[PDB]
Amino acid sequence: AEIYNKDGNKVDLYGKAVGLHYFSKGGENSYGGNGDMTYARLGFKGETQINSDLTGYGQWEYNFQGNNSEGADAQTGNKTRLAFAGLKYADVGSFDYGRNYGVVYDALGYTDMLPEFGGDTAYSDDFFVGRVGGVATYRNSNFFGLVDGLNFAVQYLGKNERDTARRSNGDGVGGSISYEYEGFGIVGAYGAADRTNLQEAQPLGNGKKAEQWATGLKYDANNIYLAANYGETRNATPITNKFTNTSGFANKTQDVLLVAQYQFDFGLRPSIAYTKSKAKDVEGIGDVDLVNYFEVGATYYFNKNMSTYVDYIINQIDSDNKLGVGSDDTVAVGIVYQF
Template sequence: MKKTLLATAIAGAAALAATSASAATVYNQDGTKLDIYGNVQLAYGYTDSLGSDASGSLDDNGSTFGAKGEHKINDDIVGYFKAEWEYDADEAKGSGNGLNDGDQAYVGAKGSFGDARIGSWDPLMDDWIQDPITNNEYFDLSDSGTALTAADDDSTLREGDKLQYMSPVMGGMQFAVGTNFNGEGSYSDDDEDGVRSGGDSGNISGSDQASFFAGAKYTVGGFSLAAVYDNLDQYEGNSVDGDDVGDQYGLTAQYTVDALRVAVKAERFAGEEDDTDVDFYGIGARYGYGMGDVYGAYQYVDAEDQSSYATNYGDDSFNEFNLGVTYNISSAMYTYVEYAQYDRAGDAGDGAAVGIYYGF
């Protein structure tokens, strides 16, 4: 899911007010509340492609419509839900692509015991490890999820069918544990080849696969340190011979002072086969200048020779960076410009973008 500045701004009060449009409350009575919200995101991006000329296009950039609600179960526990759908704002008329592309949906309960939920949402590795470095509008740096996609193209498995418990913050410490489960009835095997119908990689039909992921975060003042592990076992059986795909590890430290946030990251996709690991070492910063944010990040990627990452991107080491700036037009609307360079063969993926966001 492409996240926006609305979720990640750390600027001062003026900038925060300019990016925090409120959801519309449609019901709030007797301990039950229901909100609707959404956004329209459009961007013109110009990117290079390997083996072809650079091209530009005006596209939707993750426009969504959603509903969320909660109700009081007792004096300590609140039940809640969230459901969000994407649509193509650039081709809404006659495109047939209405609110039929689910983004995230989950139900849970929270209280002094912590927070427990089930459904579909972004991986913990994204939220705690990757997003503090780059969680931009159009261009992000690569990460262990990119390496996972290179090894197994069915990356949607990471977001759905999840169960997670997150503890309350205790003395600055917080932890989370969960699983991503794909049951034997999730896929069909029409081809009788051990690969799910349609020829996509994923689980072998007839086998239950459940991952285990866990993370811990410590926060004191403006400093926080987070570590996350995911064994990616929902991908076990992604090929006919049933090999595992690998594991993910991540460690991120960040420090926030006034309107400045600086974060550093070490992340690994540990491939199951020899010489298939990919390491990511990054640093990023974001500064709120009053009417928006200016941000940038640099990352060194070290991919072993036999990794799908090195094979797909034409080298075994990369120096990636991106830059961006936003400008708040109003409390619900902002525009931005971004540039990214990925150091890949043929300058693949390099580009620039300008876009606009309106949220309600």
């Protein structure tokens, strides 16, 4: 909500309270788990008009879990999601630095549209596919003002030598290009980065370089939303072998995501989707599915501040998955107040 707008500065303080519960049998062997998943969000987005051509901006967003006790586990799953500041100049472009979405999410965003689940390959702290720390991102809209609908971006990812391989990365560069015309959109994005010493020390994955790319097609008009993503990764998708209790990265993955939605005027937005991510040449295993499901769901929008939803994942992962990926279904039910 815009709570301040004076002397060329405006501040949006936003957030949401999400009452959320997951239903799965037993849910350790399931897609999403079982039990209370309630959380809240808080953030600010500010923008200052420096002069007629130049705007400055900043954003911070935090996740507060609502499914922890007030005891020792109080902080589990709490984190800053975004924290960056930048400048945008006329049609020249924008530049921001901090914790922000990786540039391959410019493609993966096309299918990251489900009521609760979906967007499975947009891992956090995973090079260019999700939110990540220490990215400098340059974006250009409408090719310097010269070509309506043609956008591009480049992103410089600085090394993050963390205490876990899962959350680390080396230096890298990625980019994206998109074109939009009368409801349709097409996008491509690619990034490559060094892997850290700790990452190369892991049992699963082999190589000095992580690579991720994705393409997207969408139709987004007349209350209809259809989208598809195809992508591949090298030494970039995090995996765990639940049998050996061993972790690392998949040598290769092939990822497909499809989504179809409709927005009724009375507020209901049904969703159907399909997601499959398959790993290849995993040490000790070979080829193995990481994600494989159909989705059926719906959101009901009471208005722009209140909604409820149900999201059902019909899991197609089989019970003898060689990595021990959960095979059972999950249903989420949520009630959302947002501002």
